[PDB]
Design a binder for this molecule. Structure first.
Ligand SMILES: Cc1cc2nc3c(=O)[nH]c(=O)nc-3n(C[C@H](O)[C@H](O)[C@H](O)COP(=O)(O)OP(=O)(O)OC[C@H]3O[C@@H](n4cnc5c(N)ncnc54)[C@H](O)[C@@H]3O)c2cc1C
Lengths: 981, 978
């Protein structure tokens, strides 16, 4: 509009006067060493990656040997290094870089330097550096540091003259602002902060934030609650709202809001409306946001909507739009403009003039140590400028430095464009709404096959959503209205009841009987095999695209029942909410992936190129498949094995585990809803002592798909090898048989990541995963530090019923598992030494303590035998060679992990740590279809990888038809013929 | 010459002018044939339907067969072109009569006289189904004798065709009135340059009988030229018959200008005639087998023997016609062509060389190119019609060839009379056409390697290939008597248990002595392979593939030598031995390329912040237990596949082909393969067989052999013993009981020799061999008569003599086992044929055919692995399929059928691992026919195909979280936001 253009002219002219008054920030001073290192990082993305990852690992390089080797592995030798580049050249320069952005390493030093900044005319908001909070003790250390800082500031602020203002209180900064202002990171107050336990996380954080806030109010100071990643945004908003209402008359409490979030337009509207409704005032520090790359990656990894804008100008436009909304509401909402962008700052200054906002309702904030000319200009133009000033230990100071280097050298950074790229000032001061429309239009100007979308994994449950948080209590309650049923066999499209019933109960409350399961005798199993055999010829002759359609229909049937199917798993086998939902989404992924794989593999392909001849290569099913499924992934692996057999043209006789037979019945419901032909899927739970060998030995079985224990799998393999009278085929074995999986913790591991990932790998679903970490192999010189943090984090977690989301893990599968795991725990405590043994609930339930045992060596039984429970063995390796040797010292080879930031050690692990799925710098559990096709060799399996592009072939046999096309000396010319044209 | 070329173009222009727009009957769109060919020429799919229908038509001998084939080829009435049941039968029969001068000798003679009254001479040809026996050769021979006796009685009453001078009793004053053409291979059912001398003699002896009768009436005999396979044979028949009757002028030979060889062949033949002071006659043609020769050569990696630009054949024709005309004193000339440019060229060159008219005449095929025929009559006056006569069944096959000829895209007749091609282009000097076309002309590999191609088959059209086997067999006999040790960890290990290996066709000939490994030595070889495995596994896949490539080049340089060893050690025929070695080479070249393709880790998934790479790992030590019947091919295939995938091999060759097994030692050592990667441990199964299979350090077993042993291995290998690292992977091929179905509409000219070769090639010792031929009721009696009659022509004897079809079986144990099966089968069904065998030493089993066999019989179920063929009589096609599927095996199968419905039913329900349509069911090639089956024939692994190497490995995934401190590198295939 006309008015829009007139204000834009004022902003652009203010930005022009801003640039004209300024000279480069010190980070862009290419005379200094950090300016040279950053200049080459901005020209060479390969070097940027090396340098920034080096600074990240640098604080763990605690010996001369670690440091020298990492320097060579990251940067090469002295020949390949850049001109400005050893153990002294980098160490002093990197440490000097990190000190550029921190106001001190101790509280006393920080307070002295904060006083110096005041005499230069700058206010401050003080922040405490820290490694990630992984325990209650660490949360207390962080909390008590703020309390210590506030006590030091309390004794000094009385002697500080307020920064000069235009009027008001000469004891206050600019006449109105509190002299003491601190910022706190909420998740640093609770190591288990997680919206899966929303109330518990809010309360734990609020209780510590309240203790800090009371001290702040005694000082008449300001507390700002910082905003972190999207995972915790709603938690943090709720902490702010509760604390504000507890002290409704105290004005000096702020919250950060992130303009790069699509949610923020609504979140700001909501918070303003909420403050009006409750008749309180608030303060907002508006930022763009600090986690852009992380949010984009994390959402894409989980098929979630990306919560951030992804055109940089959209964040700039959102900031100016949201800053206007705050300034319009200045009577209720104090404003802190937190940006280094001259356009953004100039826009806020002119909007404040347009809206005639009193100066005591807005101030400007920049980070200590950067954008100095923008900082000096704000001081000279506005006069109210506060530095965000972190202080503390150099180890988290190094991580902070990396984030600042990333911020300043980003391709889209306003600072880089202004002071490194010689950008045109007109384009820099452009209305970002104009930039948005241009970038969108340019963008407006992976494919599937056969009209189907490409494969994508089904979205994980998203507990940032109120509706997802509410769904599990709702659907667990709805499931409890349908208990007590008798589940029959399902054979040839008919329900068949038998007189032999086995109850299935809640492992966390065994007095809760969920239903009764009919058991098949050998007669009923034989009927199921016969029905599968009779259905096989017409199913085999069904078009592969048509067979795949049944799987797609079953996938949509499960997708529509996702929370219901999950709730059943919570009760029948003690899955935690996330674990249950991930089991159902994996089942859906198998269906969607195997449908597409059969479509891909179902068309015959010409092979060879000789003329006068056509050879077509294609696949045939085998016949009847016995599918013997585990309880620990009761829908995922059951549906994967069964649907793979079915879509490739076989018919299935399915034995679910005797303790997850209701989940097994879900397969019946899903295939029935898909309209699958009768006999193609038959459901025969039964007693292995009655019908187990019968099923495996039967001459009409052509394939056995099994996931379970090594002892049972090896026995099945032995028995299936025999060809009985009337047996058409050599029986094909698809077998997955578990593991004894290790994670290696290298000297240079990032323990803030390694500790929580190891804890989840070991104790997620109380360790009942073939992929679970049961050995953590820790390098000698990091052992004591790692186990202290691991044990301290373990002590914060609670063991209890899985329907309660506050519990980390709960009861194991049944009484037999409990007895067997407890025996293994006693064996392990005699082999090594107990480091942690959790409390468990009193009363009923198959509870085994969360157990960590140290001093374990490869000779020990709990270093070799799969326990399948919450028992973690900690092993102390003398060097990295022994760590790999120990990792490889079992009969198994299923999964493994390594936390290391050494290129040489990672290369050695990739080559020699020969598990079927090796994970680098993350947990070794949670494989996804297509991304991590899953399975191993040695005693862990027969080298079949479910969820990958080699799997379906195992359910089939190849066939070739060769035709001589020549008649009377002529043959049709075919497209791919080798000919003479 | 430009002036000569202008005279030729003007001569052609007058020719087209004198034709007056007339079209040959095949291009007359007012007639039914013209409409059918018009639509065939506009619609390639209909051409295929109509031409294949005319081919199958003579076998549609019942009303049901006919009705069903019409519907299957053409659809229902609504789906048919307008010009289109009894109407179809009569129109096709009328088409065939257009090209045939009669059905009986008396009718042919009467119609040849009518031709004379219209001014045309003739050369008479006898129609016949393919000669598949000596009796059929005698019928064909005696038909020419009968024709000549009839012509002898008539020719004296024929006034000679008018000429300008010479003898009034001869045609045009000089040509004999009786002129016949004979197809040499119709005189011998086993004509094959692999037995060059035997083929020449057999053909020559019958050709001489015909020639004597020809000379008795002062007639002309022309020896026609057939496919390139027999070209040198036929040239040699002509030269010998010429020299036996050096003074008799009226003997001709056909030469084909579409052959690259023909410039030299014509020159050689003229020089030969000058050297021997004889005269010759040449009927120069372009050639009748062009599509076949191009296909056959491409199928065998042979140089295509024909020019492949059509103008090159035209240019060769004019060049070679000039050469003949220049040599008219020695060489009489028949210009056999329907091409007005070609004809005009010959006319003008003869005029410019002043060639006497008695030294050249013109020939066309009866019933086609009618305006061309008439124009030659008018301008030249000396025009002879090639006139076949005889039975309608071969008459239909001849009709198809004529329809193909007339409607070809490059046909001069199609271009002139269907396509309205420009006259100036039609009459252009074809040398100018060649240059323009060659100018216009002016499959890839991966990583600097050429694409995979199968190694060329031995080519016995070449004198050097025919001479190589006797020379290399003799060299092998200078190498007999050696002791062959074990080969373990790069070292020779001798034991004191020696087993001789002898020639199965002459057991008194001892080829050598083979050391036997005990369990100690097998344990040592397993230990050596296990110790070599870590560094071999860590060797780059491209480097491992390089050892296979070097081994293939080492074998290629020794091809005839390696072949000769197999002739003597296991009784391979020359072709079978060479094919064994080329298949070994193919495995090496193919698996090298496959490992290069599979050796690179691939990114899987597309999520950012994450890299997943999917790749493969070897297993460890592989036991390789190889058969004697493909002793280099399958040994090298199984061993090289295990090796290239990063495993190490302990290899047990068969106890009766251990010298061939030692060739793997020689080849891998020449390639420089690291020690311990390949270990050679022949041994007694009763001493070390279970020990090798049971051993805990074995991770994979690759086996080809009997079902009984394969199933034993599968059972024992499933056990996991203390210290065993892996569940043992089985790669197993266990033989078959393979059937070929002969449908009612089968082309028996093709089916009979393909069944014979499938059943008796390498005396039936192939897992793929046809041991059951399932024949539809209504064609049973005719099929077995022709099969037995062909079998009777073949000879059983030593494989080093190429005259023998098959020879001795593998050893004394096999001979006794097979002979016992033959006796069992003779009590179940009824003997149809039992060949003679040589007297004296040798493990000979008669070539044996037994009829009346039913699925309940032992020899319809049990694999005999020898020259014993069961013939089964099925009452209908459903029963034929049911009987084909009635065994416990499912390895190979064949069907001869020209019914789309029956072929579709076979493709779906005849569920063998390798089904072959209208050809033999043996002889699978790498990549073209990946080989192997399920049921009791194997575990679904297919050697020579793109799924095979994965069976020697296990997959592995590395997943890396690439995010540090909130940032990750962006990778090319990331799902991102730009
Ligand atoms: C009386 C007589 C007897 C014959 N006897 C025999 C015989 O015993 N053996 C024999 O092999 N043939 C024989 N032929 C020849 C054969 O049957 C064809 O009639 C003849 O080749 C057609 O040649 P053209 O000059 O009539 O027609 P055109 O249309 O001029 O020439 C067609 C010919 O060119 C050749 N040709 C087609 N495409 C290509 C290409 N892409 N590249 C290179 N060359 C190509 C083929 O030879 C084809 O037949 C005989 C022909 C006649 C008239």
């Amino acid at each position: 509009s006309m008015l829009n253009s007139e204000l834009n002219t004022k902003i652009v002219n203010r930005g022009k006067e801003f640039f004209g008054s300024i000279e480069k920030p010190s980070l862009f001073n290419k005379g200094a060493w950090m300016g040279k290192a950053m200049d080459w990082s901005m020209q060479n993305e390969q070097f940027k990656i090396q340098m920034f990852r080096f600074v990240d690992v640098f604080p763990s390089l605690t010996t001369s040997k670690l440091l020298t080797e990492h320097i060579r592995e990251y940067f090469g030798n002295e020949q390949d290094m850049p001109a400005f580049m050893l153990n002294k050249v980098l160490t002093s320069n990197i440490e000097e870089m990190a000190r550029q952005f921190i106001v001190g390493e101790t509280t006393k030093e920080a307070v002295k330097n904060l006083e110096k900044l005041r005499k230069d005319g700058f206010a401050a908001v003080v922040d405490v550096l820290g490694e990630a909070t992984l325990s209650e003790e660490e949360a207390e250390v962080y909390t008590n540091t703020y309390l210590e800082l506030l006590e030091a500031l309390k004794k000094e602020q009385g002697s500080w003259k307020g920064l000069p203002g235009k009027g008001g209180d000469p004891g206050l900064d600019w006449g109105h602002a509190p002299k003491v202002n601190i910022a706190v990171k909420p998740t640093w107050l609770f190591c288990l902060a997680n919206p899966q336990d929303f109330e518990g996380s809010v309360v734990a954080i609020l209780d510590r934030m309240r203790r800090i806030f009371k001290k702040v109010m005694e000082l008449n100071g300001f507390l700002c609650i910082d905003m972190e990643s999207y995972r915790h945004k709603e938690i943090i908003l709720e902490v702010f709202r509760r604390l504000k209402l507890e002290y409704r008359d105290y004005p000096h409490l702020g919250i950060v809001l992130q303009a790069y979030l699509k949610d923020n337009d609504k979140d700001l509207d909501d918070l303003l409306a909420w403050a009006k409704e409750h008749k309180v005032q608030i303060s907002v520090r508006l930022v763009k946001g600090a986690y852009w790359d992380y949010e984009t990656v994390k959402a894409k990894q989980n098929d979630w909507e990306v919560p951030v804008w992804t055109i940089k100008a959209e964040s700039d436009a959102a900031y100016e739009r949201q800053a206007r909304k705050i300034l319009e509401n200045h009577q209720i909402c104090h404003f802190a403009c937190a940006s280094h962008n001259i356009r953004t700052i100039s826009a806020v200054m002119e909007m404040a003039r347009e809206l005639n906002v009193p100066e005591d309702r807005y101030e400007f904030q920049v980070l200590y140590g950067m954008a100095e000319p923008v900082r000096k200009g704000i001081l000279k133009v506005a006069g109210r400028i506060r530095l965000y000033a972190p202080y503390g230990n150099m180890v988290p100071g190094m991580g902070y430095l990396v984030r600042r280097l990333l911020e300043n050298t980003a391709n889209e950074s306003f600072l880089r464009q202004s002071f490194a790229e010689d950008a045109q000032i007109e384009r820099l001061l452009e209305d970002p709404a104009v930039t948005v429309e241009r970038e969108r239009a340019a963008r407006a100007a992976r494919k599937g096959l056969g009209g189907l979308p490409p494969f994508n994994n089904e979205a994980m449950v998203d507990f940032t959503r109120a509706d997802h948080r509410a769904a599990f209590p709702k659907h667990i309650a709805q499931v409890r209205t349908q208990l007590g049923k008798t589940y029959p066999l399902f054979i040839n499209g008919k329900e068949v009841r038998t007189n032999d019933l086995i109850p299935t109960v809640n492992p966390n409350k065994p007095s809760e009987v969920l239903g009764q399961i009919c058991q098949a005798g050998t007669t009923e199993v034989g009927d199921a095999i016969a029905a599968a055999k009779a259905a096989f010829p017409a199913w085999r002759d069904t078009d592969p695209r048509t067979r795949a359609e049944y799987l797609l229909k079953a996938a949509q049937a499960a997708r529509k029942r996702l929370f219901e199917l999950s709730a059943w798993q919570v009760l029948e086998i003690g899955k935690q909410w996330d674990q249950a939902y991930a089991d159902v989404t994996e089942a859906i992924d198998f269906l969607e992936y195997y449908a597409r794989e059969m479509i891909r593999l179902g068309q015959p392909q010409r092979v060879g190129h000789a003329p006068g001849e056509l050879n077509h290569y294609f696949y045939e099913p085998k016949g009847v498949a016995a599918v013997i499924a585990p309880w620990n992934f009761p829908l995922a692996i059951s549906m994967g094995m069964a649907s793979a057999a079915i879509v490739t043209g076989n018919c299935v006789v399915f034995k679910p585990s005797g303790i997850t037979s209701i989940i097994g019945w879900h397969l019946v419901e899903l295939f029935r809803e898909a309209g699958l032909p009768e006999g193609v899927f038959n459901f025969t739970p039964g007693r292995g002592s009655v019908m187990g060998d019968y099923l495996v030995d039967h001459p009409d079985i052509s394939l056995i798909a099994f996931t379970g224990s090594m002892e049972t799998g090896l026995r099945i393999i032995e028995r299936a090898a025999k060809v009985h009278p009337g047996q058409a085929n050599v029986k094909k074995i698809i077998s997955e048989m578990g593991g004894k999986n290790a994670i290696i913790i290298d000297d240079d591991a990032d323990l803030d990541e390694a500790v929580p990932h190891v804890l989840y790998s070991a104790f997620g679903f109380q360790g009942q995963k073939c992929s679970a970490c049961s050995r953590v192999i820790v390098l000698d010189a990091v052992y004591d530090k790692f186990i202290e943090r691991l044990v301290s984090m373990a002590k914060a977690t609670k063991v209890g019923p899985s329907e309660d989301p506050a519990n980390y893990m709960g009861a194991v599968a049944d009484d037999k598992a409990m007895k067997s795991i407890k025996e293994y725990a006693e064996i392990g405590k005699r082999e090594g030494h107990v480091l942690y043994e959790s409390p468990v609930p009193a009363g009923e339930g198959y509870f085994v303590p969360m157990t960590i045992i140290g001093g374990i060596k490869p000779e020990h039984r709990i270093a070799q035998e799969e326990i399948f429970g919450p028992v973690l063995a900690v092993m102390r390796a003398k060097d990295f060679d022994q760590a790999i040797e120990w990792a490889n010292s079992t009969q198994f080879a299923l999964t493994g992990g390594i936390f290391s930031r050494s290129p040489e050690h990672l290369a050695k692990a990739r080559r020699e740590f020969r598990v079927g799925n090796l994970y680098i710098n993350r947990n070794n559990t949670g494989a996804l279809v297509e991304r991590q096709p899953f399975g191993g060799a040695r005693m862990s399996g027969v080298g079949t990888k479910a969820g990958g592009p080699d799997y379906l072939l195992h359910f089939m046999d190849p066939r070739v038809v060769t035709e001589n096309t020549m008649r009377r000396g002529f043959a049709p010319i075919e497209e791919d013929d080798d000919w003479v044209d």
